[PDB]
């Protein structure tokens, strides 16, 4: 919007209902599902005759999940799978504790990489963060029961 000019002095109108994407370079991470432009006029209790104008353009972007699926979800699933195997591994082998503890170590080393990728926005827990917490608690319980 115009910073200083108000709608009684300068009026802005959208050239088209949607942003021009005809030159848009395709992103390797996001797909723009939808875009639209809206003109908003707002009137304030000081001044009935001086509406203030803005145009808001918004893009609905959906992430391409392949990178996180391959580099994050798959190794977490693999570590989760191995956690159950300790209960089939006999006690007389002595490998139970080494197995579970090394799975925990690998999971913690992987958390060291995951915490920097997960957004630090503390409004809500990410789904991948909940999955990580599940995997961690699962390993801890497996070790205790072992």
């Amino acid at each position: 919007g115009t910073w200083t000019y108000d709608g009684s002095v300068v009026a802005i109108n959208p050239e088209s209902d949607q942003p021009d994407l005809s030159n848009f370079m395709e992103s390797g991470e996001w797909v723009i599902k939808e875009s639209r432009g809206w003109k908003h006029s707002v009137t304030y209790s000081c001044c009935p005759d001086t509406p203030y104008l803005d145009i808001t353009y918004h893009f609905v972007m959906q992430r391409l999940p392949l990178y996180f699926i391959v580099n994050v979800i798959i190794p977490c699933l693999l570590f989760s799978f191995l956690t159950g195997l300790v209960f089939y591994l006999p006690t007389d082998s002595g490998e139970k504790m080494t197995l579970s503890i090394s799975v925990l170590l690998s999971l913690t080393v992987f958390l060291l990489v995951i915490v920097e990728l997960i957004p630090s926005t503390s409004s809500a827990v990410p789904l991948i963060g909940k999955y990580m917490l599940f995997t961690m608690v699962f390993v801890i319980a497996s070790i205790i029961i072992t």
Binding site: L77, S80, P90, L127, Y131, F138
Partner: protein, 45 residues
């Protein structure tokens, strides 16, 4: 031999616990994996 049988009792108990826990933990793993991603994959499709 009596003491060895008494120890083998505990060892068999531990083996049965292991065999139960293996299935329990695999079921918990698969259910936990489903419970997070299933909803969002349904919404995606």
């Amino acid at each position: 031999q009596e003491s060895n049988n008494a120890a083998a009792e505990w060892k068999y108990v531990a083996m049965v616990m292991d065999h139960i826990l293996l299935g329990v933990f695999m079921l918990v793993c698969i259910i936990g994996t489903l419970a997070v991603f299933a909803g969002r994959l349904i919404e995606l499709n």
